[PDB]
Design a protein around this ligand. Structure first.
Ligand SMILES: CN1CCN=C1c1cccc(Oc2nc(Oc3cc(C(=N)N)ccc3O)c(F)c(N(C)CC(=O)O)c2F)c1
Ligand SMILES: [Ca+2]
Ligand SMILES: [Cl-]
Lengths: 234, 52
């Protein structure tokens, strides 16, 4: 995350981090329930084998609430396309259940109609992760969050050099140099409504990070609620 | 207005049926007697920061 602030104790309990064989966080994910993690399909291609860490806020320090889980099943959207990044969504079924606790809790899945007319019409959403703090800098050892305003669909289309499909939305500042960034991919984009946080997106991609005139692109989760639901009955 | 007027007074999901509002909640919540509020059923309901 470029900008924003550190997630304070217990503030982003649904953040999951996908870790490779060298124990390096390469993508984020959102805790959906004790057995399921929501992530981007494109992150699957970033590690031959990976595990999932929860309850972590500082990669260099022992907090005590961290726990690594192996993935028993990866459910990728079979229509995911690398050339366009369309359908960038995947669900991971964990081998062992997550026990919720301080810094470990699931984000709520909303219902589509309500989510689109009410959550996505709110001014902002919140994105978080251990990604790069600067476009060409190093990934964060501290979990960060950033409030990103929703961006009008047409402005979204006009800003991009790549195709923005109906399974994506833009969020961020055109001006301000605050944005998700590399390493944050697959992570959560949530919208708070009356003190409750609902999943509204998955960090997908972006032309650089925090560039003027550019926005961060996210997978439109509301278009895949039935798909996620079905996947969770695996 | 119904759901368009302050989410129909619902804590969470609001839907309009036969010109009226129907509220509902996310899993882990029970709709209250007032048919509007959402009450957690456990200590770690979804969507809640663990500020405990
Ligand atoms: C839309 N399509 C269709 C086909 N290709 C694309 C595509 C085009 C450009 C970039 C792209 O994705 C990409 N995005 C990156 O950064 C991110 C930025 C943001 C953000 N700024 N909000 C969020 C998550 C990221 O992962 C990256 F680091 C890469 N890298 C891995 C390289 C790098 O920039 O370091 C990348 F390919 C994907
Ligand atoms: Ca740690
Ligand atoms: Cl756990």
């Amino acid at each position: 995350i470029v900008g924003g602030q550190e997630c304070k104790d217990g503030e982003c309990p649904w953040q999951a981090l996908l870790i490779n064989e060298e124990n390096e966080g390469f993508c984020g994910g959102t805790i959906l329930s004790e057995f399921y993690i929501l992530t981007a399909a494109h992150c699957l291609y970033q590690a031959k084998r990976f595990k999932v860490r929860v309850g972590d806020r500082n990669t260099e320090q022992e907090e005590g609430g961290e726990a690594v889980h192996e993935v028993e099943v990866v459910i990728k959207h079979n229509r995911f396309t690398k050339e366009t990044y369309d359908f960038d969504i995947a669900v991971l079924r964990l081998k062992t259940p997550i026990t919720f606790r301080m810094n470990v809790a699931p984000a709520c899945l909303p219902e589509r109609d309500w989510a689109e007319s009410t959550l996505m019409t709110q001014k902002t959403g919140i994105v978080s992760g251990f990604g790069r703090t600067h476009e060409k800098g190093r990934q964060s050892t501290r979990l960060k969050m950033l409030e990103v305003p929703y961006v009008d669909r047409n402005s979204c289309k006009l800003s991009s050099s790549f195709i923005i499909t109906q399974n994506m939305f833009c969020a961020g500042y055109d001006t301000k140099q605050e944005d998700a960034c590399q390493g944050d991919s697959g992570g959560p984009h949530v919208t708070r409504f009356k003190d409750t946080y609902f999943v509204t997106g998955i960090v997908s991609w972006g032309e650089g990070c925090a560039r003027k005139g550019k926005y961060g692109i996210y997978t439109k989760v509301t278009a895949f609620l039935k798909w996620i639901d079905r996947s969770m009955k695996t | 207005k119904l759901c368009s007027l302050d989410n129909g007074d619902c804590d969470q999901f609001c839907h309009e049926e036969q010109n009226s509002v129907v509220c509902s909640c996310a899993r882990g919540y029970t709709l209250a007697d007032n048919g509007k509020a959402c009450i957690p059923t456990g200590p770690y309901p979804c969507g809640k920061q663990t500020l405990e």
